[PDB]
Structures are given as structure tokens and as C-alpha cells.
Amino acid sequence: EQEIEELEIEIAILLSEIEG
Amino acid sequence: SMQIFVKTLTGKTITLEVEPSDTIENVKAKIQDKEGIPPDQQRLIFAGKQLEDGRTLSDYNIQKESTLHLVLRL
Amino acid sequence: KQKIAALKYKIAALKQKI
Numbered sequence: 001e002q003e004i005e006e007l008e009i010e011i012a013i014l015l016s017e018i019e020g
Numbered sequence: 021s022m023q024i025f026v027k028t029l030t031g032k033t034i035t036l037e038v039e040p041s042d043t044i045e046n047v048k049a050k051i052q053d054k055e056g057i058p059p060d061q062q063r064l065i066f067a068g069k070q071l072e073d074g075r076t077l078s079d080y081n082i083q084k085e086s087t088l089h090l091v092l093r094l
Numbered sequence: 095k096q097k098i099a100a101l102k103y104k105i106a107a108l109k110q111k112i
């Protein structure tokens with residue numbers, strides 16, 4: 001569960017940067 | 021006064037009615053009303069960073085029709 | 095482990111977009 005959360009954070013960070 | 025969008029990793033978009041001066045904490049409260057997700061379980065991400073609860077949408081330069089990204093936390 | 099592999103795959107693809 002903890003490793004899934006950390007990867008989800010990375011994905012959201014990247015999606016939000018690409019949109020910037 | 022304005023709306024913003026909150027997108028999950030599961031392909032869902034949530035529309036929120038907000039004010040520029042709304043705090044991130046209040047935004048998380050609004051997400052709880054739409055989704056039932058307690059604010060302590062929400063990570064909100066914008067412009068490549070996680071958003072701190074005490075600041076406002078304006079402080080983070082979140083504008084009308086901006087999209088935040090929601091990730092659950094434990 | 096499959097969920098993890100799928101997430102890493104997406105991360106690699108997103109890092110290609112930027």
C-alpha cells in the first residue's frame with residue numbers, strides 16, 4: 001500500500017507538471 | 021465565485037465551486053462533501069507540488085478552471 | 095506487484111512526454 005501511494009504521488013506530480 | 025476541477029488517477033473529474041481566497045483545507049472539505057473522503061486522506065497536487073492546507077488557492081496561483089490532482093494517503 | 099509494474103510503466107511514459 002505504501003509503495004503504491006508513493007508511485008501515485010509521482011504520477012500526479014508529473015501529470016500536473018505536463019499540464020503546466 | 022469560480023469553479024476548479026479535481027482529477028483522480030482513476031479518470032474521474034470533480035467540479036468544485038470555490039473562491040480565490042479559499043484555503044486548501046477548505047478545498048479538501050469541499051472534496052469530502054462530493055466524495056466522502058476525509059481531508060486527512062487527501063493529497064492535492066498542482067504545478068508539480070503537494071499543496072499545504074494553510075495556504076489559499078490564490079497563494080498557489082490556482083485560477084478559474086484550473087485542475088488539481090487528488091491522491092489518497094494513509 | 096502487477097499494480098506496481100503498471101504504475102512504473104506510466105511514470106516512465108510520462109517522463110517521456112516532458
Ligand SMILES: *C(=O)CCc1cn(CC(*)=O)nn1
Binds near residue numbers: 001003004005097099
Ligand atoms: C503497498 O504498496 C504494498 C506493496 C503492494 C504490492 N501490490 C501488488 C503488486 O503491485 N500492491 N501493493
